[PDB]
C-alpha cells in the first residue's frame, strides 16, 4: 500500500548460495571460509539493496559507504534469522541453501553461543508472529541503526531518513503499540549479537593464517578497518531502549 512497502518488497534480494562443499566433513576452516565467502556475496547484495532504498541517495557518499560497512553484520544476521524461520521453522540456522548449520555445525564453527543467540532471534520471529512487512521495515531500519559517535558528514539527512523509516514501521503497525515495544525490543536485540560476531570475526581474522580460514579481500579490509572502529567504541548502535 505504501509506495514504501512496495519498494522494500521490490528490492528485497534473492537467494545467495555460499558455495560450500557439503561433501567434505564439517571443520572450522571449511565452514568459516564458506561463511566468509557468503558474507562477501551477501554484501554485494546489501550494497545494491541499499542504493535502491527510499531516501538512501540523500546521504553523502561517505555516509552511505560508512553506514553500510557498520551495519552489514546486523542486517545479514536479521535476514538470516528470517530465512531460518521461514524455511526450517528455526530448528537450524539457514545461512544459505548450501550452508545450513545444525547443532553439530554450530559446535564445529566454534561459534556456538552466538549461533544459539541467533537461533533465538529466529524463534522470536515465530513467537512474536512477525509479518513479512514488519520484517522488511525492521531490516530497512537496521541500516540506519549504527553511527560513529562523532556523527556523520550529513548527520541531519541521516536523522531525517532514520526518523521516516521509524514512521513507516509505525505505519504498517498502525495494547497494539505494545507491538512497537516488542519490535523495537527485538531490533535492539540484534546488536549484542552483531557485536559478539564482530569480535569473533576480527580475532578469526587476526589468526587466520594460523587456522587456514579464508578471508575474501574486501572482507578483510572491512573487518580490519571499519569493524575495529565499532569494537573500540568509536562507532555505536542506536538502541531504542537504554
Amino acid at each position: 500500500q505504501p509506495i514504501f512497502l512496495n519498494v522494500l518488497e521490490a528490492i528485497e534480494p534473492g537467494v545467495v548460495c555460499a558455495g560450500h562443499d557439503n561433501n567434505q566433513p564439517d571443520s572450522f576452516a571449511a565452514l568459516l571460509s564458506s561463511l566468509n565467502e557468503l558474507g562477501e556475496r551477501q554484501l554485494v547484495h546489501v550494497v545494491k539493496w541499499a542504493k535502491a532504498l527510499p531516501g538512501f541517495r540523500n546521504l553523502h557518499v561517505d555516509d552511505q559507504m560508512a553506514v553500510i560497512q557498520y551495519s552489514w553484520m546486523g542486517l545479514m544476521v536479521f535476514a538470516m534469522g528470517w530465512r531460518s524461520f521461514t524455511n526450517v521453522n528455526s530448528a537450524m540456522l539457514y545461512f544459505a541453501p548450501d550452508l545450513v548449520f545444525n547443532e553439530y555445525r554450530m559446535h564445529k564453527s566454534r561459534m556456538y553461543s552466538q549461533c544459539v543467540r541467533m537461533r533465538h532471534l529466529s524463534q522470536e520471529f515465530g513467537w512474536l508472529q512477525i509479518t513479512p512487512q514488519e520484517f522488511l521495515c525492521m531490516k530497512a531500519l537496521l541500516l540506519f541503526s549504527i553511527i560513529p559517535v562523532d556523527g556523520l558528514k550529513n548527520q541531519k539527512f541521516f536523522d531525517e531518513l532514520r526518523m521516516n523509516y521509524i514512521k513507516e514501521l509505525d505505519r504498517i503497525i498502525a495494547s497494539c503499540s505494545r507491538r512497537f515495544y516488542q519490535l523495537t525490543k527485538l531490533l535492539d536485540s540484534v546488536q549484542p549479537i552483531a557485536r559478539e560476531l564482530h569480535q569473533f570475526t576480527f580475532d578469526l581474522l587476526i589468526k587466520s593464517h594460523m587456522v587456514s580460514v579464508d578471508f575474501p579481500e574486501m572482507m578483510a579490509e572491512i573487518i580490519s578497518v571499519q569493524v575495529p572502529k565499532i569494537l573500540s567504541g568509536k562507532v555505536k548502535p542506536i538502541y531504542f531502549h537504554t
Binding site: 550494497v47 557518499v61 552511505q64 559507504m65 579481500e217 574486501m218 579490509e221
Partner: peptide, 8 residues
C-alpha cells in the same frame, strides 16, 4: 579502499 572503489 577495495570497498570504496567497489561502491563507486
Amino acid at each position: 579502499y577495495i570497498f570504496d572503489l567497489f561502491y563507486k
